[PDB]
């Protein structure tokens, strides 16, 4: 038997597990649950969990375990897998990544007139008269997460001013992705920050939209890395090995980039356009110990400025 604790989400997860338990005769069960809600439990639980295995929505919440002395170190076969996005402490395995973008309908805003950093953003939308005619998800995890790596690359106090600033554009709050995107596509928002895939997912389906990147090292172009750890209490680390390796198999990586449309880590696959090179999304990305992302600051500032 293997035991999943999963920050994923279940309609991403269930095919993999469902394929590896026939391929491997391995029986899994999986729990799913939030990244925050497993970090609970685990502490909750200590000794007594019966999870072999933490596979999390984000780095940050693997960090948090890892600090936590939940989980077990990897060895260098697994971890020399991924291309980039091993963390140091190399006690879990990095299996996907996403990037925050910027999504626009291009029949309203031109390519060459965005700004080259988040924090200039607003100042763009004021200087084109975008009021009320922004979007973004106030509530999403990785909106979050974009806030937190703002607070960790320019201070809380820069991001203070640019929520702020944002908030006086009169934004429209979107509940999720899709509705936001929709509603760029409709006309009704112009442009919103959103994970790169989203972006990917409307292409596919005949979408024409924008995707602005930010220069190499903004804020507004974060890595979202998702990855897998062995916990220590695991009673079953040889079956949970075998899955970890199995999600850095080409045939699950594949499924990655292809059914869920999110970077894989590892060469052996049929790559995309929508996408910029893998090498190129790490080189964009701010330079964060993404283990360490302020999640809990930028919640508060987010509750302090009333955007939450």
């Known amino acids: ?4 604790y999963s920050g994923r989400g279940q309609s991403l997860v269930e095919p993999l597990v469902k394929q590896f338990e026939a391929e491997t005769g391995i029986r899994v069960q999986v729990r799913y649950s939030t990244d925050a809600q ?7 639980e200590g000794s007594r ?22 989980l077990r170190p990897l060895g260098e076969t697994l971890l020399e897998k991924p291309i980039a996005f091993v963390p140091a402490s190399r006690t879990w395995v990095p299996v996907t990544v996403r990037l925050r973008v910027l999504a626009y309908n291009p029949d309203r805003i031109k390519a060459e007139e965005l700004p080259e950093s988040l924090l200039d953003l607003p100042r763009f939308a004021r200087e084109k008269g975008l009021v009320g005619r922004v979007g973004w998800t106030p509530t999403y995890s990785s909106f979050q997460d974009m806030v937190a790596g703002m607070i960790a690359l320019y201070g809380e106090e820069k991001t203070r001013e640019w ?6 554009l009169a934004p ?22 959103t994970n790169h895939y989203y972006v990917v997912r409307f292409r596919r389906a005949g979408y024409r939209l924008g995707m602005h990147h930010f220069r190499d090292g903004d804020a507004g172009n974060l890595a979202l890395v998702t990855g897998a750890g062995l916990l220590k209490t695991s009673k079953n680390l ?21 059914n ?8 052996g696959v049929a790559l995309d356009p929508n996408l910029l090179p893998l090498e190129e999304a790490l080189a964009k990305s701010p330079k964060l110990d993404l283990e360490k992302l302020p999640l809990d600051r930028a919640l508060r ?7 939450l």
């Open 38 to 44: 497993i970090l609970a439990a685990l502490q909750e």
């Open 163 to 168: 929520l702020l600033a944002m908030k006086a």
């Open 260 to 267: 869920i449309g999110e970077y894989p880590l590892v060469k």
């Open 301 to 307: 500032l987010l509750r302090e400025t009333g955007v």
């Open 238 to 258: 040889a079956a949970a090995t075998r899955f970890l390796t199995y999600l850095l198999s080409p045939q699950a990586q594949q499924y990655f980039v292809g």
């Open 49 to 70: 969990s019966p999870a072999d295995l933490f596979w999390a929505n984000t780095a940050g919440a693997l960090g948090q375990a890892s600090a936590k002395g939940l």
């Open 172 to 193: 429209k709050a979107y509940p999720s992705n899709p509705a936001m995107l929709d509603a760029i596509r409709a006309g009704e928002v112009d442009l919103g920050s």
């Open 1 to 4: 038997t293997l035991t999943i």
